[PDB]
Amino acid sequence: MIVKHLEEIVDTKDDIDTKTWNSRRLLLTKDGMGFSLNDTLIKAGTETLIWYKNHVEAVYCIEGEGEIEVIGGETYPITPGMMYALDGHEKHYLRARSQMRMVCVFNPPLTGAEVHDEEGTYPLLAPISDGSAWSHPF
Ligand SMILES: [Fe+3]
């Protein structure tokens, strides 16, 4: 049996924060389910190029709006209830107009290494600036 809760996972080591996304890992390679499962927030206004050569991924949008553009393929608007699956290891752009909440399934599971290495992803456009600078302790 495995039981977890998103509200425990946030702001912990299984919550991986990147420029363009915040991935809350629900099932890890360690959990032995044969897939990994996460709840990923794609930050508003961002663009990320994605290419998983060594996994297939299912993505189920439960909040927000954006689009996925397949390289050499079509562009599919993302809205709540939209699902895409990269069974062809498609190279694609993932764009978030508003923040998107995505339930994602990877086969085989992603490893902690791969998530922290940001393997398979290339962040291209980060969220608009909130006026902060690294050199402003405040
Ligand atoms: Fe994707």
Numbering used by the authors: 1 to 138
How is this structure described in the published paper?
While the EctA and EctB enzymes have amino acid sequence-related counterparts in various biochemical pathways in microorganisms, the ectoine synthase (EctC) is considered the diagnostic enzyme for ectoine production. Crystallographic analysis of the psychrophilic S. alaskensis EctC protein [(Sa)EctC] showed that ectoine synthase is a member of the cupin superfamily. By using an ectoine synthase from the thermo-tolerant bacterium P. lautus, we were able to obtain high-resolution crystal structures of the full-length EctC enzyme in complex with its iron-cofactor, its substrate, and its product. The (Pl)EctC protein is a head-to-tail dimer where backbone interactions between two ß-sheets mediate the contacts between the monomers in the dimer assembly.
Since the ectoine synthase is an iron dependent enzyme, we added Fe(II)Cl2 to the crystallization solution of the purified (Pl)EctC protein to a final concentration of 4 mM and pre-incubated this mixture for at least 30 minutes prior to crystallization trials. Without this pre-incubation in the presence of iron, no crystals with a quality suitable for X-ray analysis could be grown. This approach yielded crystals which diffracted to a maximum of 1.6 Å for the (Pl)EctC::Fe protein complex. Since the monomers of the three (Pl)EctC crystal structures are nearly identical in overall shape, we only describe in the following section the overall structure for the high-resolution (1.6 Å) (Pl)EctC::Fe complex in detail. The structure of the (Pl)EctC protein consists of 11 β-strands (βI-βXI) and two α-helices (α-a and α-b). Since the asymmetric unit of the (Pl)EctC crystal revealed only a monomer, we inspected the crystal packing and analyzed the respective monomer/monomer interactions to elucidate the functional dimer within the crystal structure. The data resulting from this analysis show that the (Pl)EctC dimer in the crystal is composed of two monomers arranged in a head-to-tail orientation; it is stabilized via strong interactions mediated by the N-terminus (sequence 1MIVKH5) from monomer A and β-strand βVIII from monomer B (sequence 81GMMYAL86). Clear electron density was visible in the 1.6 Å (Pl)EctC crystal structure for an atom with a strong electron density, which cannot be accounted for by a water molecule. Only when we refined the (Pl)EctC structure modeled with Fe2+, we observed neither negative nor positive differences in electron density, indicating that iron is indeed the most probable element present in the crystallized (Pl)EctC protein. Within the (Pl)EctC::Fe crystal structure, the iron atom is tetrahedrally ligated via interactions with the side chains of Glu-57, Tyr-84, and His-92. A water molecule completes the tetrahedral arrangement of the (Pl)EctC iron-binding site in the substrate-free (Pl)EctC::Fe crystal structure; it is present at a distance of 2.9 Å relative to that of the iron atom.
